[PDB]
Structures are given as structure tokens and as C-alpha cells.
Homo-oligomer: A and B are copies of this chain.
Amino acid sequence: QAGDTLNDVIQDPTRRNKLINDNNLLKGIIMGRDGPVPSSRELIVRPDTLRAIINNRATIETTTMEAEFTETLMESNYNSASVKVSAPFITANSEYSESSSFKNTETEKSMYTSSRYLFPQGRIDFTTPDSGFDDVIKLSPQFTSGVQAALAKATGTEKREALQNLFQEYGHVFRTKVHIGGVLSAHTMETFSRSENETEVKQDVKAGLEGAVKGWQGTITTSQNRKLNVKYIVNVVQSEHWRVIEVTEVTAVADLLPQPIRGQVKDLLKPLLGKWVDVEKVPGLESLPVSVYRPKGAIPAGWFWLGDTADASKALLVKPTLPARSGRNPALTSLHQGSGMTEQPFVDLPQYQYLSTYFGSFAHDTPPGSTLRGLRPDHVLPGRYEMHGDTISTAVYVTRPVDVPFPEDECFDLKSLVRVKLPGSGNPPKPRSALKKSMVLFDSGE
């Protein structure tokens, strides 16, 4: 047995099957409220062999992440690409709450750090259908039949509910490249002012955490006298004890389906249905440098708007696709009047955000206030401000999307209006967010 490698394990059918079963290589990851836990239902068909490479270099690696809800992924040792792919699901299914230790304000920045002391044995890879090679993985007939049954339902709401249940059961992503071996992991989070040198905070934290993982103390003091709380994970103990130590690539489970069904599933999974409507100029507010526009007429029943905009052409209405249910984050939230000395609204739910400040008096019991809603944190991305006006008392910001080369991250250009100086005191934090284009479905007959 001594000197045995992943090659020998794969060559022996019994040992190969034991490795597959013990590492859950045929199952997707559910990315739920408890984190990336593998499902208990097989997603793909058992392969007759595995693609593997041998690697035995033991060393300490360190990774850093800036996303908010990626703590569990970092604890599971997902590289940057895998964390980026999995972030939407983790955010959507997370448990939001105030008093979150993570801070991402315009003045301070928070980051997660993870150090892995690895004893690798190799890497196992799977062929996705998009690759185009002859050894693609084949989805299980049970999963395919479940998808067909979900898409064969009478109504769009029923189809979406069936798809949600199916994905909650079978997982949201599939690990396509996984490293085998043992690993001792140490994870921490650090918040620091944006003015501080980021390439020195990162270096100090990395040095401290690397020293901590080499020795193996729940608390660490770095060179800069920074106090860090460290969480330790042990995944080391013979080929029978080899376990997955790192995920180098994941592919969304939806992407594994044939194209005609994949398109329908992706469209049906969009949280919001969108619509374009005419706009009307808000009476008054002649002091402000730019005009304020709100949706004209009565909002159609069941639809909501997102806030005041400087665009004089059209306004975007959105409608939830999934009915509100316990244990599921709503796509939108109601807003409530502020506590005192402010007419601005506040998000009912912990970590939701609206795009524009209210230009007037907000009353949630009467229109158009009763139809104003916030957004789930995964629906929005940070934008940029364009300033108008000559004085603080009347200045406004128009929120424009941050141009990106990849269409996947494009955001709607709603030109949300933000008052520079809100009269009174105790106002809500200024919104600087833009809606994601991928979260809205247009032209549907729904």
C-alpha cells in the first residue's frame, strides 16, 4: 500500500468507487442557509473511470475574498472562480440580519482570509457538456425526469416552485475539479479603514494566519497588533482517509442541461418580472437642479416600483415571481416610515436596499408609497455617482451603472436620484446601488 497514488486508487474498481462515495463526487452542493453542504441524491451517473493527476507538494497557501456572504465558501476552500460562481446562490439563500460583523461602507472595508496547510495527492476532473469532449458527464435519469416534470406544470408559478424544490434537493452547483488529500485550514475576517494600505493589511493578516496554521489558540495577534479570531478545520488523518481539500472549479447545475431546456430553466429562475411604463414629473421641487420623475398613473395590481429617477422617458416596474413563503428570502421588501425627524423610508428586512431617496413624504399606507419596495442584497451591485447642483442644500446624485466588459454583470441604467443632503437627522444610509439586468425577465406572457 505504501507508495500508492490516486492512479492506483482509480485503477482498482473497489477503491475508486470507495473514493467516489466517500467524497460525494456524484452529488451537487446545495448552497443553502447552512452553507455548501453536499446533497444526498446522486446528480450524475457513476463514471467507469476518473481523470486524475498526481501532485504531492505540501505547502501553505493563502486566499482572500471581498464578497460579503462567502464565509462558508472560504471555509470550504473554494478558489476565487468557484466563489464567484457560487456567490449568487449563497447570498440568495443566506440568513440576513443586522449587527453583521461584515462592514462594506464607503469608509471601511471588510475581508475574509483563509490559510490552508495542504498535503495533496492529486486532482480529479469532470467533463462538462459545454466542453464538447466525448467523455461528458451524463445527468441521472431521475434528475432529468424531475426537470421535465417541473417544466410540464400548468402555470409558471407552479413551474418555478417545482424548479425551486428540485434545486433545493439536488443542489445548485457541481464540483468539476477537486483536489484530494489532507488539509488543515485556518480562517478569519478583518475590517479596516479604506485609507489604510490594503497591501500591508493583507500581508500582515496573511503572515499571522500562516504562522497560526504552521503551529497547528483561538485568537492571534499580528505584527500590527491586530487581533484576529481564527476558526480551525481539520481534514487530515492510507488512501482510505483521503478527502476533498479544495474546489478549483464549479459549474451551475442548470448549465449541465441541454440547451433548449437550459434556456427555459434559466429564464424561469429569474426572481423578478420587469416592465417599462410611462413617467410623470413630480410637482414642486423646482429648487433642485434636475427634474424628478415617478411612474405615471396607477401602478398595475401586483406590481411595484423601485424609486424616483431622473430619466424622463420610462420607469421600471417589477413583480415577484415566487410567492412569499416561510424560510425563503422575498425578492422585495416593504418600507416603513422613519422613527423621527425624517420623511425617508427604511427597509423592513435587515439587509435589503432601495435605489432612490424619496422626494416627498413617505406613507406606506397610501400610493405611490404603498408600492415602493426594496431589493434583496443579491439583486444589486454598487454604482457610481454623477453630481448635479451648485450648493449642498440642493445637490443630487444620479446613479449610473459601472461599465463592465462582461454582460453578466451589467446593471440597469435607471438614473436613480439621491439627495446629497437630506434635511433633518437620523436619515437612512444613502443608497448607491443599481439593479442587476440578469435578475429581471422581460416580454414574458406571465
Contact = CB atoms under 8 A, between A and B. Distances in A.
A124 B39 CA distance: 10
A178 to B, nearest CB: 12
Chain A, interface size category, equals: 35 or more
A405 B325 CA distance: 8
Interface in A48-62: 51-60
**Assembly of this chain: how many copies?**
2
Of the listed residues A54, A229, A238, the one surrounded by the most CB atoms of chain B closer than 10 A to its CB is A54
Contact of A54 (B22, B60, B169, B232): B22
B199 A327 contact: no
A343 to B, nearest CB: 18
Interface of A: 2-3, 5, 7, 18, 21-24, 27, 33-34, 37-41, 51-60, 79-81, 95, 99-101, 123-125, 131-133, 165, 169, 198-199, 202-203, 207, 210-211, 214, 218-219, 229, 231-235, 237-238, 240-241, 243, 248, 324-327, 330, 333-334, 348, 403, 405-406, 408
B406 A54 contact: no
Contacts of A243: 56
Nearest to A79: B34
B218 A54 contact: no
Contacts of A325: 406
Nearest to A211: B218
Contacts of A18: 7
A99 B327 contact: no
Nearest to A238: B3
B80 A37 contact: no
